[PDB]
Amino acid sequence: RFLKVKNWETDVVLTDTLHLKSTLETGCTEHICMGSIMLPVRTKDQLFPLAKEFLDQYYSSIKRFGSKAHMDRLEEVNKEIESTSTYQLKDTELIYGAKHAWRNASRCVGRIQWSKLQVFDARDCTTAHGMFNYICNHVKYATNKGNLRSAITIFPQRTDGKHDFRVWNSQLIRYAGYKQPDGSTLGDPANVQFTEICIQQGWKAPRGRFDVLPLLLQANGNDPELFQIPPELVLEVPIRHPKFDWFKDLGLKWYGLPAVSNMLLEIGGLEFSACPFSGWYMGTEIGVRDYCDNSRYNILEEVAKKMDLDMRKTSSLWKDQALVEINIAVLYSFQSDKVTIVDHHSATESFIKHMENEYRCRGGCPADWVWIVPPMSGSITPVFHQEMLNYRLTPSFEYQPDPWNTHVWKG
Amino acid sequence: RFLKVKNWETDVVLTDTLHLKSTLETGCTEHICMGSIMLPTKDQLFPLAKEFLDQYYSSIKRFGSKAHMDRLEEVNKEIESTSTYQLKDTELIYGAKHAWRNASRCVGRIQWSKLQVFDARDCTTAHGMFNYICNHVKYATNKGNLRSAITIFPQRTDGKHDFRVWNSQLIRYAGYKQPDGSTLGDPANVQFTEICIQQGWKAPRGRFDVLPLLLQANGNDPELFQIPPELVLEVPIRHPKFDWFKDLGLKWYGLPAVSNMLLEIGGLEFSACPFSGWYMGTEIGVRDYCDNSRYNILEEVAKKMDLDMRKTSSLWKDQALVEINIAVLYSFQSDKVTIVDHHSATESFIKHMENEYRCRGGCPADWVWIVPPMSGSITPVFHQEMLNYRLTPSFEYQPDPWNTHVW
Ligand code: HEM
Ligand code: HEM
Ligand SMILES: CNCCN(C)c1cc(F)cc(CCc2cc(C)cc(N)n2)c1
Ligand SMILES: CNCCN(C)c1cc(F)cc(CCc2cc(C)cc(N)n2)c1
Ligand SMILES: C[C@H](O)[C@H](O)[C@H]1CNc2nc(N)[nH]c(=O)c2N1
Ligand SMILES: C[C@H](O)[C@H](O)[C@H]1CNc2nc(N)[nH]c(=O)c2N1
Ligand SMILES: [Zn+2]
């Protein structure tokens, strides 16, 4: 069965056959749509189909489907599962897997870049100090003095679920938040809980508005340990505005390297619970969400006040006005310092091109509209007008519980 | 199967029980979400009637009463007999208000119960439809102090005698192709406009000509009527800061009034049920004015503002967008024509959603449509999880009549 999607701005219709390869479920039924819900130990049994299906895809992509090399590899993984109950990926398969999990990531607007991903294999890693070393090398390599490069670092896979590698940080670089006794928050409210764990674990917190958090690293199911990323490895951009000279006096900066460290990468049924990956920012992630969400830095009022907008009624659009100026400021600061960044016009347009190309070459492109459409100026971007089909392909990135919720402490 | 929704901005969690009364299907399955797709006999009729009368008599606390039973009884008699049935006024009104209450794409539902319902089931000809429509327009406009209304024409019978308003809205601007190959007026109406020309409208060929109504009674061929111009309240668009704004020559109409939808109540279908409320400013300033396939004035505005249009990354589009939208709200406000901004309207929808959770056990909502087309994440609805599902009574899409009308 074929499925059509239409662009209501251009009238282009595409046809999706790829959804036919979909495995995991959506959360939706014929009776309820769960499309705006934020979040909607494995045996030998389930594992062989999952391996087989992955290796069939791998071998197709390399035009070697059904070859002797293909059959020997199935054969080999098969024996390895039965006798050891898991199996090891070849390097080539890990690389292909990691790229595909990004390619398959339906909430990711930046997927046009999926095939240029630097894969760092850290499956020989055994300790938290070794993890720190790997993560430093990833940061320096991805940062590349501002000319950002996509990378991912892959730590050993889950075995019995009692020996998991985890990066406790949600991103490798992120600012501390501190709840004050008066109930206000200093720094980033989104990281208060994690900041507190760090403090409990022994971090001496500077207690400023922009303190880079220590890495908190768990190897092999052991208690996690703290490490401070060398500051010279943390590229930051002071935020100023091309026309408003008081803008710099707001005291804003952000880091250059967006690097998600809390997701789980699934490849042929194997689970990589620590697999930090990084790209570069779209400007609105910082300018709209990080700065202007109410539950984040929330600078809208102070910006609008300095701009002396009429703030007595919402229908002045003072919020919307301050919002644009802040986003101009973020993109200007990053460009001026030569740190890679993309605005939401350029990103979404590239994404529409990527998506059409995917339909032509691949039979589809799973996409989550709720997430792809940017958080300002929705309908003046070509994705707002694009119908999308959301389904789940593997390899994939998945959510996993926060480790402080599940970790069995040793002491 | 008892479902939670969370607001990620405020941590408020609501439990939804109402979805377990979902009738119709979503287009979604466990394998594929179709959340972003624009459009995904005697036997049938009696359950539909019963399910409807059950909620009605429940709403007035006479569930299981003699009057409830008698009524189910009577409607049963009438279906077996006449193969259809007729709503009591009281049912009709409850039905219409509930179709709006159930509209998962409508951000404006906090108003749902203050809807003035005009019963036009006695209407028989197109002139009659024109009269009813003019009264609806004048009533809802109310010299700028707008009031919600719907006017309900007779229900479908054998589908050969449908009433339909051919216009998509009661009030819209015409659309014409040039030798130029560009488009004069509103490109979204080019086709309807030529049906008007080809049915005989003398078009003035301007940028903002209010189209005529094309009314179809009892399955006959539709007829043209012009709305008395004095009933069409329009607003010249100026900016409170930019004096040149006014010379763009923009105006819009005060009355948003959708006329192409099918209203379904207890199985019965009202194929002509024009309804109206008042605009949220982004509809005109973001969609009408800035969509590429609409009036698409972003470029001209940014030019007048002398923004750097060299690089997408100056955000000149975003800048001109805010200004266009400030000007819509300002103009409507200045002329005292009811309008709501996206901040105000979404904040009110969150309040409604909470009332519905508390008093009804849920509120079907379509996030894709509820979040405004600008400044999404600065409105509280962006951070609100919504469950989308289909309750009846409902408004439904229906095929454009020119594709269906045997002339
Ligand atoms: C190259 C630059 C990239 C850009 C501009 C980009 C853009 C984005 C943005 C804006 C989001 C939504 C973020 C949010 O609002 O929370 C996102 C989601 C995501 N991206 Fe990217 N992305 C990039 C690279 C990558 C890379 C390298 C990967 C993995 C290798 C990746 C995988 C994902 C995934 C898995 C999600 C969804 C996360 C979830 O479900 O929460 N992206 N992308
Ligand atoms: C009081 C002012 C109202 C406001 C501000 C309002 C707001 C909106 C908006 C912004 C939309 C989406 C429209 C679009 O983007 O094309 C919408 C959809 C809708 N509203 Fe309203 N609404 C109002 C009154 C009404 C009334 C009176 C009814 C019916 C009695 C109604 C039923 C609907 C329906 C059925 C839809 C979605 C139709 C579709 O699937 O396209 N609304 N509402
Ligand atoms: C609940 N979701 C919030 C945290 N999270 C799990 C997350 C995951 C991503 F893959 C991506 C992001 C966004 C950060 C990011 C990550 C990358 C790799 C590129 C880019 N431009 N931005 C967040
Ligand atoms: C692409 N959209 C499909 C067009 N369409 C059928 C439509 C239906 C509505 F209920 C409402 C609207 C929007 C117009 C409107 C209608 C009403 C009644 C109030 C209001 N503020 N705005 C369109
Ligand atoms: C409730 C809702 O799904 C949630 O706010 C989503 C909406 N869309 C999003 N889109 C992006 N890219 N990132 C987000 O965090 C969210 N949050
Ligand atoms: C493809 C997508 O479903 C389509 O563009 C939708 C998006 N959200 C919308 N939201 C509203 N309120 N009105 C619309 O016309 C649309 N269009
Ligand atoms: Zn869905």
PDB file of N, CA and C and ligand atoms in Angstrom, chain A residues 38 171 258-260 262-263 277-282 285 371 399, ligand 3:
ATOM      1  N   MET A  38       4.706  14.091  24.215  1.00  0.00           N
ATOM      2  CA  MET A  38       6.197  14.213  24.192  1.00  0.00           C
ATOM      3  C   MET A  38       6.946  12.828  24.241  1.00  0.00           C
ATOM      4  N   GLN A 171      23.032  16.736  28.084  1.00  0.00           N
ATOM      5  CA  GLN A 171      23.872  17.137  26.983  1.00  0.00           C
ATOM      6  C   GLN A 171      25.297  17.247  27.541  1.00  0.00           C
ATOM      7  N   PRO A 258      25.909  21.678  20.402  1.00  0.00           N
ATOM      8  CA  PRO A 258      24.773  21.013  20.968  1.00  0.00           C
ATOM      9  C   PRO A 258      25.095  19.510  20.881  1.00  0.00           C
ATOM     10  N   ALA A 259      25.070  18.814  22.017  1.00  0.00           N
ATOM     11  CA  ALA A 259      25.537  17.411  22.070  1.00  0.00           C
ATOM     12  C   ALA A 259      24.679  16.558  23.031  1.00  0.00           C
ATOM     13  N   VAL A 260      23.759  15.816  22.453  1.00  0.00           N
ATOM     14  CA  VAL A 260      22.775  15.059  23.246  1.00  0.00           C
ATOM     15  C   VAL A 260      23.449  13.802  23.776  1.00  0.00           C
ATOM     16  N   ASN A 262      21.853  11.595  26.305  1.00  0.00           N
ATOM     17  CA  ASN A 262      20.958  10.775  27.157  1.00  0.00           C
ATOM     18  C   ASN A 262      20.068   9.804  26.380  1.00  0.00           C
ATOM     19  N   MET A 263      20.279   9.718  25.069  1.00  0.00           N
ATOM     20  CA  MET A 263      19.500   8.831  24.263  1.00  0.00           C
ATOM     21  C   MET A 263      20.127   7.454  24.142  1.00  0.00           C
ATOM     22  N   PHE A 277      25.986  12.328  20.766  1.00  0.00           N
ATOM     23  CA  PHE A 277      26.066  12.773  19.394  1.00  0.00           C
ATOM     24  C   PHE A 277      25.892  14.323  19.355  1.00  0.00           C
ATOM     25  N   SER A 278      26.483  14.953  18.375  1.00  0.00           N
ATOM     26  CA  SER A 278      26.509  16.397  18.356  1.00  0.00           C
ATOM     27  C   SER A 278      26.409  16.783  16.917  1.00  0.00           C
ATOM     28  N   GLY A 279      25.854  17.980  16.695  1.00  0.00           N
ATOM     29  CA  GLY A 279      25.798  18.569  15.386  1.00  0.00           C
ATOM     30  C   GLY A 279      26.174  20.056  15.550  1.00  0.00           C
ATOM     31  N   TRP A 280      25.321  20.919  15.000  1.00  0.00           N
ATOM     32  CA  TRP A 280      25.396  22.357  15.238  1.00  0.00           C
ATOM     33  C   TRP A 280      23.944  22.939  15.432  1.00  0.00           C
ATOM     34  N   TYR A 281      23.824  24.147  15.947  1.00  0.00           N
ATOM     35  CA  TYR A 281      22.512  24.593  16.400  1.00  0.00           C
ATOM     36  C   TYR A 281      21.738  25.212  15.260  1.00  0.00           C
ATOM     37  N   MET A 282      20.424  25.094  15.345  1.00  0.00           N
ATOM     38  CA  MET A 282      19.534  26.011  14.620  1.00  0.00           C
ATOM     39  C   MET A 282      19.221  27.107  15.605  1.00  0.00           C
ATOM     40  N   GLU A 285      16.647  27.174  18.526  1.00  0.00           N
ATOM     41  CA  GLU A 285      16.793  26.307  19.709  1.00  0.00           C
ATOM     42  C   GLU A 285      17.289  27.158  20.875  1.00  0.00           C
ATOM     43  N   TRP A 371       7.423  18.479  15.813  1.00  0.00           N
ATOM     44  CA  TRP A 371       8.774  18.844  16.114  1.00  0.00           C
ATOM     45  C   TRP A 371       9.551  19.547  14.998  1.00  0.00           C
ATOM     46  N   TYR A 399      14.308   7.198  23.680  1.00  0.00           N
ATOM     47  CA  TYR A 399      14.411   7.775  25.005  1.00  0.00           C
ATOM     48  C   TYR A 399      14.728   6.691  25.993  1.00  0.00           C
TER      49      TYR A 399
HETATM   50  C1  LIG C   3      13.078  15.829  25.430  1.00  0.00           C
HETATM   51  N1  LIG C   3      13.983  16.365  24.372  1.00  0.00           N
HETATM   52  C2  LIG C   3      15.004  17.338  24.857  1.00  0.00           C
HETATM   53  C3  LIG C   3      16.415  16.718  25.083  1.00  0.00           C
HETATM   54  N2  LIG C   3      16.673  15.695  24.050  1.00  0.00           N
HETATM   55  C4  LIG C   3      16.445  14.282  24.426  1.00  0.00           C
HETATM   56  C5  LIG C   3      17.141  16.038  22.729  1.00  0.00           C
HETATM   57  C6  LIG C   3      17.464  14.997  21.798  1.00  0.00           C
HETATM   58  C7  LIG C   3      17.964  15.273  20.490  1.00  0.00           C
HETATM   59  F1  LIG C   3      18.300  14.261  19.626  1.00  0.00           F
HETATM   60  C8  LIG C   3      18.123  16.624  20.079  1.00  0.00           C
HETATM   61  C9  LIG C   3      17.818  17.667  20.985  1.00  0.00           C
HETATM   62  C10 LIG C   3      18.090  19.105  20.535  1.00  0.00           C
HETATM   63  C11 LIG C   3      19.574  19.525  20.748  1.00  0.00           C
HETATM   64  C12 LIG C   3      20.371  19.348  19.426  1.00  0.00           C
HETATM   65  C13 LIG C   3      21.169  18.213  19.153  1.00  0.00           C
HETATM   66  C14 LIG C   3      21.892  18.082  17.945  1.00  0.00           C
HETATM   67  C15 LIG C   3      22.712  16.827  17.686  1.00  0.00           C
HETATM   68  C16 LIG C   3      21.791  19.116  16.997  1.00  0.00           C
HETATM   69  C17 LIG C   3      20.977  20.240  17.292  1.00  0.00           C
HETATM   70  N3  LIG C   3      20.866  21.309  16.451  1.00  0.00           N
HETATM   71  N4  LIG C   3      20.321  20.309  18.465  1.00  0.00           N
HETATM   72  C18 LIG C   3      17.298  17.391  22.282  1.00  0.00           C
END
